[PDB]
Amino acid sequence: SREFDTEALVNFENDNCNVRIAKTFGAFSITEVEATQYLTLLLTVEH
Amino acid sequence: SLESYETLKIKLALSKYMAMLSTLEMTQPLLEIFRNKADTRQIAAVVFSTLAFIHNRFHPLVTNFTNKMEFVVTETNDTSIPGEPILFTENEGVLLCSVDRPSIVKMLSREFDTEALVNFENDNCNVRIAKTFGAFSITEVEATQYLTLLLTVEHAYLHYYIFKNYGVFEYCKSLTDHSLFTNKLRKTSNLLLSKFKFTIEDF
Amino acid sequence: NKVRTVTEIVNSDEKIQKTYELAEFDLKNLSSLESYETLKIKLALSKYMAMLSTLEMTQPLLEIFRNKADTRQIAAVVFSTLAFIHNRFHPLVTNFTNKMEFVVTETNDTSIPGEPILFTENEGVLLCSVDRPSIVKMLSREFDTEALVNNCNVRIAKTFGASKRKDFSITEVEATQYLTLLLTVEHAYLHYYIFKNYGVFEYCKSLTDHSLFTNKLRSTMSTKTSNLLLSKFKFTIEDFDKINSN
Amino acid sequence: AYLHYYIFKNYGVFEYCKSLTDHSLFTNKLRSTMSTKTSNLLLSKFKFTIEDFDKINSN
Amino acid sequence: LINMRRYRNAARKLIHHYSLNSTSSTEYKISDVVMTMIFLLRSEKYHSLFKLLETTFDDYTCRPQMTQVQTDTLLDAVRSLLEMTIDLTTVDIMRSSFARCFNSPIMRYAKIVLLQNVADKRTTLEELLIERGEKIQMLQPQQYINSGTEIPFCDDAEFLNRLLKHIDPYPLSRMYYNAANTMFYTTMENYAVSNCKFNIEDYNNIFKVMENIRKH
Amino acid sequence: PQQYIEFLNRLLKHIDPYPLSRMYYNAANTMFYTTMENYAVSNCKFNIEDYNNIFKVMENIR
Amino acid sequence: IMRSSFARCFNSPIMRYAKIVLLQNVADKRTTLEELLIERGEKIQMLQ
Amino acid sequence: LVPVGMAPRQMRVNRCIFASIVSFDACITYKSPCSPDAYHDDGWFICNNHLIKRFKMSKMVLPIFDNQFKMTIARHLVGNKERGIKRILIPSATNYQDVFNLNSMMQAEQLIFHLIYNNENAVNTICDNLKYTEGFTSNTQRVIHSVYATTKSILDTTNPNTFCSRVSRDELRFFDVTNARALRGGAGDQLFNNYSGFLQNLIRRAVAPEYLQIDTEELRFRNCATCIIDETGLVASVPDGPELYNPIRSSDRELDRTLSGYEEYPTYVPLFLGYQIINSENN
Amino acid sequence: MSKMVLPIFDEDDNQFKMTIARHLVGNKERGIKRILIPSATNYQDVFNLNSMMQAEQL
């Protein structure tokens, strides 16, 4: 239930605006929170 | 004199563009055509013919040219890019040409400094006096408007050539950075944009 | 400030120089930004009014808050506002997860000045405390619908450049009521956000001094979330310095 | 009024407002084009002045 | 004779400002105070309020004593004047404000003050926090919703457009000013009634925070 | 998507007395002013050097 | 205007020279050209 | 709540009846194709898309005048070689069930047709079947009631004015072949009467009269009739002989050198039939 | 008469465009006023040759 800092933190990522613009001109799911919860449980059970 | 001959050549190129316009046979001046949003077909035809004319000039040996192109006349601010009134996107294989009609209309409607500026000219009063003793038209403003549109479409056509020759990726990168064509002529000579220079300075 | 441009032909040396004063473009930009922000805020306010209508409560807002008996509607409105603000900060969120409790205080010895809406957990779930008398007092205070609020050069330039155009019970008074409620709930939501994400001690410290809001929020708000409603204007207390000296 | 409007059209609304505040800008903003290409101003027929201008200014 | 109507209008405006019942802010002057007092004296209806304010001419650091009938009459008179609701707390607020005004000297400049001397013991924000929080925790939730749920967003875009049109002529500047001053004055009233110092610094720190978040 | 697809000597005389240099000046200034207006409306930063590059012509050595 | 002009004349002393003045004291608050510009322009824009 | 108590709001309204078509199977999402013209407050209560799809008809305007009055008019989309049932531009109440393939289209549209055409038996049959089909109570019942209410509202808007027009003295219309010396005209007025009030309004909006007598002036738009009416309904047939060639250039070098920008006469076939009379302008 | 063109086949490249002119005669003119191309027996009367230049008459 603990709130995760998904949006809060900013981290390095593939951010080539040129690629984004080129793509724009050429034109059941799991959330980040769920993935974080799931990782937490997996690591707990790993311990 | 020599420079006058190059001036004559440039004016001849403008006259050829005029022949293209007459071939299009528009009743209204381009200013009114662009002001009239309903004349979407006229605007598209004008742009396409100008692009084909510029293509022929830039590739004199090449007479071929894309004979069909998707067109969209944009009006909203969010549908236009500053500094690029004409755009060439692709809708997954479909080539779209976007036009910023409000920007075109604004540029055309801008008052020009025809009379305001004074520039060197053939002013031999002796010749004038000798002549005095021996004794459908286009205005300077219209010529200026027409040159402005031709140069705008020249910029658009250069971006289009980058798009076709290199691809959409490089076309976008050119839109971002225009340094590719500081050299320009390196074909290009027939493009008026290679005839002069324009610069901006902090002041 | 200013700039200038020079036109020249490649083969010729006759150059034409023109000068531009950037103030005109500055006015254009400022007018565009002002209009855009006004449109955004009015859109948000209309959306808030529309969702409250969707709840479909017969009475108007002030009458609802005056009707002490119908705590149901008060709680519904408060929660809806809180969720709306929460989503405005996290557009992907359309619910509030953990259930919420609500209580409507009725006395000064039960209300806390300066925080009409507040939060406190019962060690299992969060409870929202509401100062309905204070809400009624705010929304009932007579509003000024006449006086205007406010560089003279750019002011005149905007005056001469910008234009003007000459079945809802809403007047500017009701719009003001809705805006006041939204701002109050936004303040309460900021308090609650600091609480949830920094502990009850930090929540209490924030209540004591809101200044902590600066870091505790700007760490996430200014970057990922729509700016605060108050961001539309810079607010200040009249004669603030002399009042502080007092 | 036409001079004001000319300055407006050819120099922007901010320049128009500044001219309204002070007509002196008219000097350059117009003489750049008026005295050269256009018929002189009607007022050009005479030199006008305010009686006791200096003392009035001192007032 | 006197223009009892103009006197009444000035009295009403001054009373609104001094009771914080109107966000409207305007200039006021000794002429206005005199208007008010003369109207109150002339009006048989408002003799009780006239007496209350006149008593402020003395030490004014005192609690007037009234019967329940007297208090009801005074509240009825005030409520009829301002056409609203009201409270003896507002009565005391007006008493204190008018006492401060009367005691203040004639000055070339207006005097900007804060509400105070309303309802003896000075309490800090911390003590109020402790006591109010204890009482709140004692209280029990009148109503609640379950977990999850769903914010009921509207859907009718035409309805949204109609509302937008209806609100377009409303100046955001005026609405913001009115709302902010409403909240500020209600907070002022709460503090003064609680006899706890108002933290002007933190109240302004709220906007400081707004700006600091905006700048990033 | 919306849409898919002699006397010139006399006209040369018509335009011959025109100051070509002034024509370029007017056209370029119109373009630049419109670009600045669009940038200001969009609140987007402007790259002066890139605009110069747009209208930059290199000179050969012959 | 006549009242103000005649008051100025009457209050003025007997002088060997005429006194050249400007109209003033007609209709309390001093307003600047800039403030007049702002207010009048707003009202005009309101007008249709 | 925001709005005044009740206070019926004012906004635009989609007018084509077929805009209300929706899949009764709530689990199946469907969007009907509507031409934007549907949002024009005009005599047309069908959008261009539905008109072309179902009736083979396209809207059109006929300038009339000093003051240029615009008279609504539809035109043929029928090709030259179409025959038999294909020539039924608007089927009659005795033939629409067959001309329109009720089986091939949605139940909601079938109900719409059985409402437009006054077929109460079919409407009742559909209503009862939907009552006993699928989760009627949950949402299908409400959807059906909404569609029925919309159709009935449109029909109640139209029919009273249609009846007043029928009994009207000032405005008179006669849908027949003005060439009385003809056999393909028949009792066109009787057939028009047989049509429903809303259908009669559609016919009025679509078919222009061959002649038009305004007060004392008569304007003859045609020396012939471009369509007829029989028991089958509105038929895109030439009353006198060979069908008119309908190129259908769209939708479903020396020559041009000479024929550059040059006035061109359209090949469309507008609907001209019958006599119309009016007193004053009433416009 | 006003010149006009009537396309016949205009599908892909078959572009039969028969030419045609339009009446410039209202619904009130009659006789000479309505005659478009008079016969040799009456053209002199229909046209006001005397009102036009002798070259046009020729």
Ligand SMILES: [Zn+2]
């Ligand atoms: Zn439709």
